[PDB]
């Protein structure tokens, strides 16, 4: 009935919060509506990751014959095969594994846990409607709103509904021949990306001239110029106007540019999420803002006397490691020791990946941004070109660029942001360095690694 | 026939220095006896990696199939080939490339180039025996001996001759099909790995229990481990005493301990290098120690007046981006403006990387010298053990390990040893971040990206 911490959402923040909590010794509960891990471990990060990792493979294979592997075999883009059913399968055994592994985590650390919908009442208590289906009602003395986003779905334009979104692409039982992904957000990046990698005929709709608008230039313009360059169809300035199903069942996307793709099996719509708003959190006087989002405070206090918020529900950057790392801190503060009582996390410069084809990695401003916050004169930028030692054996190649934003007299490092092979492994300890206050001196006071491609990064213009 | 600066040896650190000297306006000579870019272009860093890809890539083609990859066709260890001829071919082809650029860049940066043997005549001028099959002799102001090192033979060994080094490694046509490696340091480590993912039956002979002994314990163990478990025969305790041929042409390899590897096709010595001298050292003074290596102090500077030595020859942390730093440091001093008068490289807390299978990185001390120096009670270490997450879909296994050693109240991280796919690429930002001057406090500092290996290291124990 009565608990400490009540945490609505069983995500990446919800399920890190209450076993910091109760970590310190506090009756928590925490309530799931579907499947413990959230979107990350579910529809996000890991499936993503181990989708990734399939497409990797298919090209390096390609590039065995040319090693000196194999030879006798035809490992070639025309003699590839992908065995989707079979790959889901497995793929869904490791999460199926996972969700099994932190329910018995939070059973072990003594978190209780209950899966069905909560909302709020208007006594200010939940009610959480049971998948035994019993509604039982239960009240705290804080509670923890961590219920995450859900896909955009562009409902204005006709035949939208014949599209699915990212946890659709994760349902897919069977290759679609012909796919057109829309949105140049990083989601839809990765999947177009998977979905070439595997084979599939693949478009990638975008509104301007480069995907990635959230990022640097560099990172906008090389992604953008070698999905072109390996096959994936990338349709600049467009936008979907309407989709149509056929005799053939196949849909045609009609583009406003008079143009169209015709003969396609699969569309996927990757325009954004929008906070995850199901529980009653009128009844509780929870303001939003104007984009539906839960405000949160900078210690995740929304307005409401002992109610917190924090992860994608709240939309400041949206990754799992932000959620838990907002979780926990809130945890620590409401729950730990003294020296915790003002503990929140800070939001800037936290890096980030994009596991595109090759991979990306920023951390911290653009060029842009650099220009506009300090001034062109006080702004160095670092550059650097070059094809990884892997491809020399090849006639495939593959791009790196590097490239280190300096802010003030003293070369201070604003923002770090990388394209090629290792960017994702590469960027975790410059990250480290850059939350030190690391200044272009710093990069280059460590020695390098040969022969690597992060070496560059110590060893610039 | 005078110039400001002469360079004995066109490897990785005489290459450097008189790059950089040359940009400072001083009539420089660079006198190389074989190929530019010395040791680690042409029979190192270089073909060692490209190598190191091949047997990579093998391994991966094994795991394409479990992948969902290529089902028709048998990729598995049972199938693999390997055209060693061919790939030997395109190894040397991107050499002899890397040997164009190298000549190119310096006759453009206003290096004289000379190829000969250099030796010091009394007189305390440089003579070259050409290949015009001249001989002239040169005198300059200042004198850089960069002449690096060779393999160690173990000449007390009856049969000893009947193996190569390295260098043989890298001339071999076609591949052995057994093959025996002698030393746990890195070199031999990595040819090892290279020869198994290759599909040789190799054999690793060792005098103790682990492998790279030089390194902190959790590399030699995770190392010396997965080498077994992989099919790599480790012989441990043991000592070769003994060398034959058999009718067969083949070797039979007689150990210490009584007992014997046969029909034995390549035998390689990878038991450490000495300073390659040979030049004129005696006819003007340069004191060597008790190693055969030149002496020589934190500025480079030998005993003799106007003559330096680093590299290998010096022998003090053996690696290219080491001689290339304090190749230019020292180019800085002599040539480039009043500002780095008393420029010199700091050898502490140097990176380094193993590209055994898997890769380890290491920097800073082991926890034996950690305790050693700063006592027991003065030491904390955090440890993590874990499988990437690209092994869920495979019945095979690869470890990662990762030892934070910290020092002091504030935990100051004084060693990162690492194992696993992706170190190489991973240990160069931490690099920067401990230069720095890093605690733990500072890893924790910065968000994780997930999904990667990197991760770990900022969210330990
Ligand atoms: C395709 C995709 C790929 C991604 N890849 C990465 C990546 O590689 N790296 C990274 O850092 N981030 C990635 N992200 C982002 C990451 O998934 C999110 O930032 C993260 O999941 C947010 O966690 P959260 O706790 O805010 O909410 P979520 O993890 O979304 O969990 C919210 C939970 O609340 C539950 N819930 C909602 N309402 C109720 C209710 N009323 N009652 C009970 N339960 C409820 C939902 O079932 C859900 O389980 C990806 C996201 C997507 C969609
Ligand atoms: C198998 C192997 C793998 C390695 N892998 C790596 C690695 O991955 N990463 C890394 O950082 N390091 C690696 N190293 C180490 C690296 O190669 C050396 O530390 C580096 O080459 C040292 O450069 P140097 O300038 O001291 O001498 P070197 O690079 O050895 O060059 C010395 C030059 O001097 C020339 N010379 C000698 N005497 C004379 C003379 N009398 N007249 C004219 N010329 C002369 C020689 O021909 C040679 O070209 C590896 C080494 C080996 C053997
Ligand atoms: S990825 C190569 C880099 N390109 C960019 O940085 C583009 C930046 C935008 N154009 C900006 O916002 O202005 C790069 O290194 N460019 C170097 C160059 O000289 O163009
Ligand atoms: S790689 C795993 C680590 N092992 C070691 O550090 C071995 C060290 C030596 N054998 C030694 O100290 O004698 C590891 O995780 N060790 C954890 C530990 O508690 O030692
Ligand atoms: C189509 O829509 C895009 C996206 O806004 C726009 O840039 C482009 O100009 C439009 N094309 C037209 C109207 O010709
Ligand atoms: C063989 O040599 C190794 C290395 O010195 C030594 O450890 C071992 O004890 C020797 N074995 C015997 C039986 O002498």
Not at 137 to 149: C, D, Q, R, W
Not at 184 to 199: C, Q, S
Not at 359 to 373: C, N, P, T, V, Y
Not at 430 to 441: D, L, P, S, Y
Request: with cysteine.
């Amino acid at each position: 009935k009565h608990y400490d911490y009540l945490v609505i959402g069983g995500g990446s923040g919800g399920v890190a919060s209450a076993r910091r909590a109760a970590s310190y010794g506090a009756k928590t509960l925490l309530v799931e509506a579907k499947a413990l891990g959230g979107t990350c471990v579910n529809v996000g990060c890991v499936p993503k990751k181990v989708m990734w990792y399939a497409s990797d493979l298919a090209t390096r294979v390609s590039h065995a014959n040319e090693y000196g592997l194999y030879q006798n075999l035809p490992l070639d883009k025309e003699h590839l095969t992908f065995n989707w059913p079979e790959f889901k399968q497995k793929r869904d055994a490791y999460v199926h594994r996972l969700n099994g592994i932190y329910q018995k985590n939070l059973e072990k650390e003594k978190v209780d846990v209950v899966f069905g919908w909560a909302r709020f009442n208007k006594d200010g208590n939940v009610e959480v409607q049971k998948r035994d289906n019993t509604t039982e009602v239960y009240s705290a003395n804080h509670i923890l709103v961590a219920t995450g986003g859900k896909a955009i779905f562009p409902e204005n334009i006709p035949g939208f509904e014949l599209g699915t979104d990212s946890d659709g692409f994760f349902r897919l039982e069977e290759q679609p021949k012909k796919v057109v992904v829309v949105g140049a957000g990083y989601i839809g990046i990765e999947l177009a990306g998977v979905f070439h990698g595997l084979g599939s005929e693949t478009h990638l709709v975008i509104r301007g001239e480069t995907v990635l608008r959230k990022f640097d230039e560099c990172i906008q313009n090389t992604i953008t110029d070698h999905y072109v360059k390996e096959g994936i169809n990338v349709h600049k300035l467009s936008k979907i106007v309407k989709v149509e199903k056929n005799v053939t069942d196949k849909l045609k996307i009609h583009m406003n540019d008079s143009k169209s793709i015709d003969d396609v099996d699969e569309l996927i719509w990757t325009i954004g999420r929008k906070s995850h708003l199901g529980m009653g959190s009128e009844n509780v006087g929870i303001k939003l803002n104007s984009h539906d989002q839960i405000i949160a405070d900078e210690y995740q206090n929304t307005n409401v006397p002992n109610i917190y918020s924090l992860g994608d529900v709240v939309g400041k950057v949206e990754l799992t490691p932000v959620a838990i790392a907002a979780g926990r801190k809130l945890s620590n503060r409401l729950f730990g020791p003294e020296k915790f009582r003002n503990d929140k996390l800070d939001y800037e410069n936290v890096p980030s990946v994009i596991f595109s084809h090759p991979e990306a990695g920023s951390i911290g401003i653009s060029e842009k941004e650099a220009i506009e916050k300090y001034g062109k004169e006080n702004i160095k930028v670092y550059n650097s070109k070059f094809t990884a030692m892997y491809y020399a054996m090849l006639s495939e190649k593959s791009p790196t660029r590097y490239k280190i934003v300096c802010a003030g007299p003293n070369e201070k490092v604003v923002g770090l942001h990388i394209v090629g092979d290792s960017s994702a492994e590469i960027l975790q300890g410059f990250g480290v360095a850059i939350k030190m206050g690391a200044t272009k001196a710093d990069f280059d006071n460590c020695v390098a690694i040969h022969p690597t491609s992060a070496e560059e990064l110590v060893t610039m213009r």
